Amino acid sequence: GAMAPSYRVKRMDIAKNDEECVVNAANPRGLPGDGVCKAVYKKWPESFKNSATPVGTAKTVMCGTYPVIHAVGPNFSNYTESEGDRELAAAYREVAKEVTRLGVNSVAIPLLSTGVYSGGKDRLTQSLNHLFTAMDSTDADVVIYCRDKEWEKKISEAIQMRT
Ligand SMILES: O=C(NCCc1ccncc1)c1ccccc1F
Numbered sequence: 031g032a033m034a035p036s037y038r039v040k041r042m043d044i045a046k047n048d049e050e051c052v053v054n055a056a057n058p059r060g061l062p063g064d065g066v067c068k069a070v071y072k073k074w075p076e077s078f079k080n081s082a083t084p085v086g087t088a089k090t091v092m093c094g095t096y097p098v099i100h101a102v103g104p105n106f107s108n109y110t111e112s113e114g115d116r117e118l119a120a121a122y123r124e125v126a127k128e129v130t131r132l133g134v135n136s137v138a139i140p141l142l143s144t145g146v147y148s149g150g151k152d153r154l155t156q157s158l159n160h161l162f163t164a165m166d167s168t169d170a171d172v173v174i175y176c177r178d179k180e181w182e183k184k185i186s187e188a189i190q191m192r193t
Pocket residue numbers: 065144145146148150151152153177178
């Protein structure tokens with residue numbers, strides 16, 4: 031574990047992370063996709079061998095010795111708010127199991143189901159709170175990666191609020 035497990039946020043490409051493993055915001059079919067998923071495909075294409083996994087699950091595939099955790103959040107275009115919320119919470123619980131199993135001291139994570147899978151709604155708070163519920167019992171250093179300065183400030187404020 032980390033000596034003093036922490037949460038941090040950075041506004042940059044998760045493909046340039048400084049952590050011991052990465053969470054991909056994957057599609058269920060293991061396809062290159064767009065956004066975080068395409069950057070992850072360009073950086074770690076070997077990790078997409080047999081990466082397909084259902085919604086609400088995470089599947090780890092090694093790129094060399096570097097673990098890529100493919101986490102499949104729901105597409106809120108297709109799910110009800112209620113069922114989507116359940117699957118989004120589940121995806122993060124499976125990420126916490128994988129991070130623990132791998133024995134890493136740090137993980138780079140995106141906010142699942144907040145972009146092309148958001149169904150056109152702001153899900154910063156919803157996605158971040160499910161991330162916290164899952165990861166709070168892990169002792170890895172968590173570094174959250176986002177695209178926009180607005181969200182960088184809101185994620186930073188949410189982390190600082192808990193102290
Ligand atoms: O800002 C948003 N999402 C995070 C950034 C992001 C990343 C990748 N593709 C798209 C958007 C957002 C806010 C309100 C409604 C819909 C949104 F998608």
